[PDB]
Amino acid sequence: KTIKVFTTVDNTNLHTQLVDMSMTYGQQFGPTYLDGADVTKIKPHVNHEGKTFFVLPSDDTLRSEAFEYYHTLDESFLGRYMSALNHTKKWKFPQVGGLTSIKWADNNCYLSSVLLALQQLEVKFNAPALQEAYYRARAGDAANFCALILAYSNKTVGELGDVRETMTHLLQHANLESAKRVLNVVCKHCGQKTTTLTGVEAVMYMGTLSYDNLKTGVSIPCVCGRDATQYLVQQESSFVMMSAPPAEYKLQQGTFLCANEYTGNYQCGHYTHITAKETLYRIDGAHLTKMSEYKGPVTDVFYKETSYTTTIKPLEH
């Protein structure tokens, strides 16, 4: 006695399989999943005929497809994905201030923050799965997106986390090929020393929340004792994330796009999101608070951008 089922890795290619009812799925396809449920150990029922099954890639076609789907070489991705999905499917994703958030549960504030942030950024995801889940998230269904975020970050549900790290791990799979940043360092006698950065490295900074301070100058310790001045020469990208250790900072109306606040210590803390349009909107999970201006311990500030050139000029000393 046999049954006809389908096995897939990308939810696009459904590979026909004549499953043996005597043996379990585990003994045939390996670790299997039916709608997020691990049925690797249970044997095939007649009920399950015609249904689609999610497997780990075990041959060249499945490996190729799975890679083309997830843009990762790690074959264990699906496992963590489903493991997270089983939980994210339960989270509630209300619409707050024209954006999809998440009800506080399982320390998801940083996920909620990166989600809210991403919805306000102009970005393309290169991984089909991630892009689809992103669109679905913007629509209102963001369980799969969260699960994928957890998967790509090697973080499990419930774990506390850093918004910046997650943002990095995500933007890895974002389309920032044309994103270009060039900076310049100047000392007293060490002259001018320029640097070029691309991709994720061209839209991330960790040292100051202010975008202007990057254009004006930043005091960085140099070789010859005296502090050198670092300043942004050129920034060709859609947006810029400026981060720093959690510090008291005053947010103003027309100075940025959105930002993240982190209240607490390096032991345990809570994230809150700030987005600016008419007034300033503070999103705390499912809760919303309108505001005139925010003075608090903020860690990440996002700025919109197109193409920027400088006024600055060096002086060969």
């Binding site: 890639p57 490996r63 497809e65 890679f67 074959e75 799979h173 090929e177």
Partner: protein, 75 residues
């Protein structure tokens, strides 16, 4: 033998090669085509990363086969 080389952003290019050509050779041809240093190139096929030593005829690469190219910028 014509083959495709595609980036994760979908940017694709075409290369005339042979089953005899090694990975370093196609990487060299990539360098010759678009000017990407062979040291930064990571090629992928069948969901597996390719080693600079072996050749296309080992990884079962037919004609009009698509190789996935991702970049590993030094530093």
């Amino acid at each position: 033998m014509q083959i495709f080389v595609k980036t994760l952003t979908g940017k694709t290019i075409t290369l005339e090669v042979e089953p005899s050509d090694t990975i370093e050779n196609v990487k060299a041809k990539i360098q010759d085509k678009e000017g990407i240093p062979p040291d930064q190139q990571r090629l992928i096929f069948a969901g597996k990363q390719l080693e600079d030593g072996r050749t296309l005829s080992d990884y079962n690469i037919q004609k009009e086969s698509t190789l996935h190219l991702v970049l590993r910028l030094r530093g």
